[PDB]
Design a protein around this nucleic acid. Sequence first.
DNA 1: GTAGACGTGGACG
DNA 2: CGTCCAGTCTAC
Length: 288
Amino acid sequence: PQGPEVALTADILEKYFKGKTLEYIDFISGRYSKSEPEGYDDFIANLPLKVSNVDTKGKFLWFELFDPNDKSNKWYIWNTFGLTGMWSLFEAKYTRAVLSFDNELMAYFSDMRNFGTFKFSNSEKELKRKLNELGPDFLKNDDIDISKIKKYKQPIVALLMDQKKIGSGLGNYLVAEILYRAKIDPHKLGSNLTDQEIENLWYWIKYETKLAYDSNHIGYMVNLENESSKIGRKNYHPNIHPTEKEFDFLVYRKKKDPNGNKVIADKIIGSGKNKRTTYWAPAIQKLE
DNA sequence: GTAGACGTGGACG
DNA sequence: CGTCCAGTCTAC
């Protein structure tokens, strides 16, 4: 999941678990049933702990916890979702981690491919440096300076898929959709964009992230769609208002765009076994 | 730059 | 059966 899904997920985890007391976390299968996550033993030795919040930056999610009788000593759960990571209020297929709160309340993290990660830490300093490895959150920051794009002689699709250079939160489908709406060829070097292209790109980045955030059935978050429609949405990018009510794929994994224009499934970014497919429509997206 | 890896599928032929 | 597609790390 990308920025929008991770953020909505954290909103839901906060609604249900902020102020609750975590009593145990069990890794019942997957990678962490075979090997302990970093810091697990030390964290477990300090349970139970009260959840003070759940927050996100880009695709990175974390819990903040503390003991009411020593409110200064804070604990953190670091979480990345990878490709198939998903939280839920019920024990779904591929459940890897089970969080047990007071009064039989439960949270479950599921992950088919096991690419998601957990780390436990007692260091606010370590988290701060971690957050500093990520660019500003595309969804939650309303004034990122997108003109930094022009300094890089690299394909705009790679610059946007990077989590540090311009901003964090965008992934394979957001980028493709954004570049289609902005009418920009994915190959175009950031250093070749005009100031108008940049302004237009920033408009559409906000438009798409907000649209995805606001959606109730994006796909991945099936395990929370009951909760998604029962919770509100924070007023990110307040001045931008998508017309559609659900996020729709215009080019991603499509053979044609909505107007019948051919969609190319291009392999621009990556090498070896990390190559990604960039969907774009040449008829619409050009170098101008 | 290039290459590989991390489990587990779904869709399709 | 088979093939291809589906966030981020690491090394030469």
